[PDB]
Backbone as JSON, one array per atom type, in Angstrom:
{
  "sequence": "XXXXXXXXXXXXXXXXXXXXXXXXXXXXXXXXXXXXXXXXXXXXXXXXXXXXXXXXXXXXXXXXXXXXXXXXXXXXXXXXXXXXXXXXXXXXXXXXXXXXXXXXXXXX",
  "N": [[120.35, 101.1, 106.92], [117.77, 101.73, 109.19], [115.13, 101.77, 111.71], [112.16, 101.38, 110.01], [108.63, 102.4, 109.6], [105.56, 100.27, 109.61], [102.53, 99.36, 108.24], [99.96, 98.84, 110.69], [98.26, 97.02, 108.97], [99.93, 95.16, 108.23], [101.18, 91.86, 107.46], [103.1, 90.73, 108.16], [103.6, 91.82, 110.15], [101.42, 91.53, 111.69], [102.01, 89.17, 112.98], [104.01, 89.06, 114.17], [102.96, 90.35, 116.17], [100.76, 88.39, 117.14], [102.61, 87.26, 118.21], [103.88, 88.05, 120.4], [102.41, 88.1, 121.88], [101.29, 85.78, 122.6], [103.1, 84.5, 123.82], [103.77, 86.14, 125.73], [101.29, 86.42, 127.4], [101.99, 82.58, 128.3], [103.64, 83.94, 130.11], [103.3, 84.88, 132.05], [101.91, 84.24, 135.01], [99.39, 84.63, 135.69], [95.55, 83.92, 135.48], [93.91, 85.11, 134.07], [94.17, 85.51, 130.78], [95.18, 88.24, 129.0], [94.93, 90.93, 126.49], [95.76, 93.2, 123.79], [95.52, 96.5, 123.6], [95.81, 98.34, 122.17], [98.09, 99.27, 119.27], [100.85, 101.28, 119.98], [103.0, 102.46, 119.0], [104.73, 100.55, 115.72], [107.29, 99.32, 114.46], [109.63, 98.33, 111.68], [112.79, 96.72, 110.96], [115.61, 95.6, 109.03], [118.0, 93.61, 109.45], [119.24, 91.1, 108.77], [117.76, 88.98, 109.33], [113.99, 90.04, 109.44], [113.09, 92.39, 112.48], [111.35, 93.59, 113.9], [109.6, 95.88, 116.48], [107.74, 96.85, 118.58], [105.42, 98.64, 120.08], [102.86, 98.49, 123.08], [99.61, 99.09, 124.28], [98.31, 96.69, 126.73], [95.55, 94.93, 127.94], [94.06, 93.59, 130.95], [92.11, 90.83, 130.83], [88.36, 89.07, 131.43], [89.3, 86.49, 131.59], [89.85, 83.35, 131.31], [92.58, 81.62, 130.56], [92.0, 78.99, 131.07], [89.35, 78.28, 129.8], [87.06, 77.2, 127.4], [84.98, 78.68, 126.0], [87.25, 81.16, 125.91], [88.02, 82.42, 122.94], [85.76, 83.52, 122.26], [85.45, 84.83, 124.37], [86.85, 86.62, 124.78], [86.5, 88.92, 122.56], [84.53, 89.65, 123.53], [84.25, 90.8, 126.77], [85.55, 92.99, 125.71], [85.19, 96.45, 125.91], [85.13, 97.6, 128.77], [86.84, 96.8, 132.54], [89.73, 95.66, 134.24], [92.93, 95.72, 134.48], [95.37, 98.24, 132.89], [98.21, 97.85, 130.47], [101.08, 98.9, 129.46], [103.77, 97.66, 126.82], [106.99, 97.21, 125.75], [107.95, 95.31, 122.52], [110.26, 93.4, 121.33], [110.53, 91.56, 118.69], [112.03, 89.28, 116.4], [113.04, 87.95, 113.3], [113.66, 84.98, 111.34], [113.97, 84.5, 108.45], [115.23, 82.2, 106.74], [115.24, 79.73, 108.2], [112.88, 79.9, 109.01], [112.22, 81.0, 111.48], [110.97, 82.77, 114.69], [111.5, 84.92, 116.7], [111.63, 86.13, 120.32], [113.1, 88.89, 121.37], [113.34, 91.07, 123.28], [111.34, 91.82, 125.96], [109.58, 94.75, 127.11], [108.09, 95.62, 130.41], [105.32, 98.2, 131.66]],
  "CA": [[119.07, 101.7, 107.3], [117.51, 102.19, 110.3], [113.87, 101.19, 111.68], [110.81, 102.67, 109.88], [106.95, 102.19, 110.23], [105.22, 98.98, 109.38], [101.29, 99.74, 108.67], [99.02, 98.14, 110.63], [97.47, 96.05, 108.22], [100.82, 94.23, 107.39], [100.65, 90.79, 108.15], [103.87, 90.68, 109.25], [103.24, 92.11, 112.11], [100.32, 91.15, 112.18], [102.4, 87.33, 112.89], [105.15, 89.3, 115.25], [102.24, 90.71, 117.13], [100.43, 87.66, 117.78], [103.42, 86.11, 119.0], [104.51, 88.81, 121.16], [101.38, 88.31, 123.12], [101.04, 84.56, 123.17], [104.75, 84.54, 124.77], [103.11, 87.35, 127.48], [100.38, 84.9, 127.87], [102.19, 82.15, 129.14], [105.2, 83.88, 130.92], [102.45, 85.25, 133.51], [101.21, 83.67, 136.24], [98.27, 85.25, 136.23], [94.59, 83.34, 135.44], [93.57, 85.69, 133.22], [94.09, 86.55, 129.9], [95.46, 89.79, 128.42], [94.39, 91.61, 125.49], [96.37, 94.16, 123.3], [94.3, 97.06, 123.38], [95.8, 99.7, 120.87], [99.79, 99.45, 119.08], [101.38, 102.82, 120.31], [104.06, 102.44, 117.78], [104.79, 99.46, 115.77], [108.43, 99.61, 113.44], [110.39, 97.29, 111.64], [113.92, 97.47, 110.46], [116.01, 95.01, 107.98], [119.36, 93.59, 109.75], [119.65, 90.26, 107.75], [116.44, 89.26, 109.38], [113.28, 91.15, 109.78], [113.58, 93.08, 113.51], [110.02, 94.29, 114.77], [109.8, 96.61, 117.54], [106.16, 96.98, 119.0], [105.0, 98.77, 121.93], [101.63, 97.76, 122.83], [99.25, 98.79, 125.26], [97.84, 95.36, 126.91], [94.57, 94.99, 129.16], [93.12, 92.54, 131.45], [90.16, 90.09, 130.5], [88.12, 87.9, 132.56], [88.52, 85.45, 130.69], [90.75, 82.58, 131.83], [92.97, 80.39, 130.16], [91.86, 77.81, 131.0], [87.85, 78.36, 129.39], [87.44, 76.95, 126.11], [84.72, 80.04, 125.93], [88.29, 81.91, 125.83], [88.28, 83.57, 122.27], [84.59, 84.55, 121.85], [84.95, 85.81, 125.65], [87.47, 87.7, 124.58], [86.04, 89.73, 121.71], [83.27, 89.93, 124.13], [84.41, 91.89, 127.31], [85.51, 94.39, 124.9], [84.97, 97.85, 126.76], [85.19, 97.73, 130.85], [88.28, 95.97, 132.94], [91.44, 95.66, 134.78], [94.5, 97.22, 134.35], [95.99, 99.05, 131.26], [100.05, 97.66, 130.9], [102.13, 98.84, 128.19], [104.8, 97.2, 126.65], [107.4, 97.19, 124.32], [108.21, 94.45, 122.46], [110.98, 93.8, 119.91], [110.35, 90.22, 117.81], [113.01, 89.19, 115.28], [111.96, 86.34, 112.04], [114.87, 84.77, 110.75], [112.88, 83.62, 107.29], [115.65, 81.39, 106.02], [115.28, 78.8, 109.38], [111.63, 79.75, 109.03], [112.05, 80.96, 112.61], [110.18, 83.88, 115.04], [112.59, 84.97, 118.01], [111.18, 87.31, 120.65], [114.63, 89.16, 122.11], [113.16, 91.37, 124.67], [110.07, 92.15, 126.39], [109.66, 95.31, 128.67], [106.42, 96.23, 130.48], [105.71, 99.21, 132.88]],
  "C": [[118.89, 101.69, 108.81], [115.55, 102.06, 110.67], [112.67, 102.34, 111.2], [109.35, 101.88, 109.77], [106.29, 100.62, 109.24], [103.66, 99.36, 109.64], [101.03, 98.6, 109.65], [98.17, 96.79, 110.14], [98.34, 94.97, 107.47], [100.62, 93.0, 108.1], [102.18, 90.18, 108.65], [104.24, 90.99, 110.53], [102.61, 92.15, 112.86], [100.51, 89.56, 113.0], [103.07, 87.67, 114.42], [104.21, 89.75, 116.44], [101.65, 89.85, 118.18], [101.96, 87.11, 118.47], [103.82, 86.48, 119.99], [103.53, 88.35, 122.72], [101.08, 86.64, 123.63], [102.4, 84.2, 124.49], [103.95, 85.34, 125.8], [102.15, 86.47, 127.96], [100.55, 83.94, 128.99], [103.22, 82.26, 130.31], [104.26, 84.34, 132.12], [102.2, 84.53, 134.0], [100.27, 84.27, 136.67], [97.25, 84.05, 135.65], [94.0, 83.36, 134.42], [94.27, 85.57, 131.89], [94.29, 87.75, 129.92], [95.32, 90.0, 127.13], [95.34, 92.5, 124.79], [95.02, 95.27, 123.09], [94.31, 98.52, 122.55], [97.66, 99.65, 120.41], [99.83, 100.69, 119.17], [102.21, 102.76, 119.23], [104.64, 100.93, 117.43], [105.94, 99.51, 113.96], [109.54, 98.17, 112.98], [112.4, 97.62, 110.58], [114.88, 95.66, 109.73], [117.32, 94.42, 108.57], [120.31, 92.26, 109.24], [117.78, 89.45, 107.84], [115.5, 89.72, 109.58], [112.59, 91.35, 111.17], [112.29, 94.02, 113.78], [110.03, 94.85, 116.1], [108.6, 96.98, 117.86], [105.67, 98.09, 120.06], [103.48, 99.03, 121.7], [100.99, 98.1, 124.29], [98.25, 97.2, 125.72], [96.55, 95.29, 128.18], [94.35, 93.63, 129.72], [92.23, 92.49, 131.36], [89.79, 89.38, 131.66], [87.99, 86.78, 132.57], [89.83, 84.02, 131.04], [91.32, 81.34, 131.01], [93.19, 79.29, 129.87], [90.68, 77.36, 129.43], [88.12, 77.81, 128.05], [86.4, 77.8, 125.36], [85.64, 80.68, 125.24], [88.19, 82.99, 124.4], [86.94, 84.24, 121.78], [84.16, 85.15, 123.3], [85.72, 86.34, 125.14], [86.8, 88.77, 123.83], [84.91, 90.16, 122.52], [82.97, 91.07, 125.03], [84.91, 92.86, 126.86], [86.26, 95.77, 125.68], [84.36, 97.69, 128.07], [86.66, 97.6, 130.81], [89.13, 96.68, 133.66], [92.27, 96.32, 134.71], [94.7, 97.6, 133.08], [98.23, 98.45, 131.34], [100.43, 98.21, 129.94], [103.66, 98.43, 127.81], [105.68, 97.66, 125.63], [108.45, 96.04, 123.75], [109.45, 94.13, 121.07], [111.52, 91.83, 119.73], [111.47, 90.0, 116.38], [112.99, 87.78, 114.22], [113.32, 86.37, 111.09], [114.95, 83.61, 109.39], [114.04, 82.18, 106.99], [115.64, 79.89, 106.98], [113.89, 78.63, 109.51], [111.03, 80.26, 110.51], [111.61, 82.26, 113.17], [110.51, 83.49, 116.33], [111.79, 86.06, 119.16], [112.71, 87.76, 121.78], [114.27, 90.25, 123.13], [111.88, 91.78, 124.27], [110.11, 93.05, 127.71], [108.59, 95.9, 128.83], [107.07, 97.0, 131.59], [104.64, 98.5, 133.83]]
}
């Protein structure tokens, strides 16, 4: 096979998603918080384990890492902000180890 579509509402990627972004999280050096703020395309494909491929636009919050505020500021600033990034992310879950790999990450 070859990679095909993965709704939305699966919760597997609903797992590969969060993780994509906690990893973006702390590889920044920024202050802030970032947000996902719409999946552009989000595909998964079968190769022994299951091989998620994301791309994700991502915004800046004002909401700082540190705050313990942090996840009801988030849901909060909503609509304004910062920059727009998009990424694309491709997460790989290697069930029988129980394990969740992220093998690349490329932003513009």
């Amino acid at each position: 096979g070859a990679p095909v579509p993965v709704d939305e509402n699966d919760e597997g990627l609903q797992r590969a998603l969060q993780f994509a972004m906690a990893e973006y999280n702390r590889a920044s050096n920024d202050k802030y918080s970032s947000r996902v703020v719409r999946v552009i395309s989000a595909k998964r494909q079968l190769v022994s384990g299951i091989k998620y491929i994301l791309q994700v636009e991502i915004g800046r919050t004002t909401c700082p890492k540190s705050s313990g505020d942090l996840q009801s500021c988030e849901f909060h600033d909503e609509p304004e902000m910062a920059k727009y990034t998009t990424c694309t992310f491709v997460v790989y879950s290697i069930p029988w180890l129980n394990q969740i790999k992220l093998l690349e990450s490329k932003c513009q």
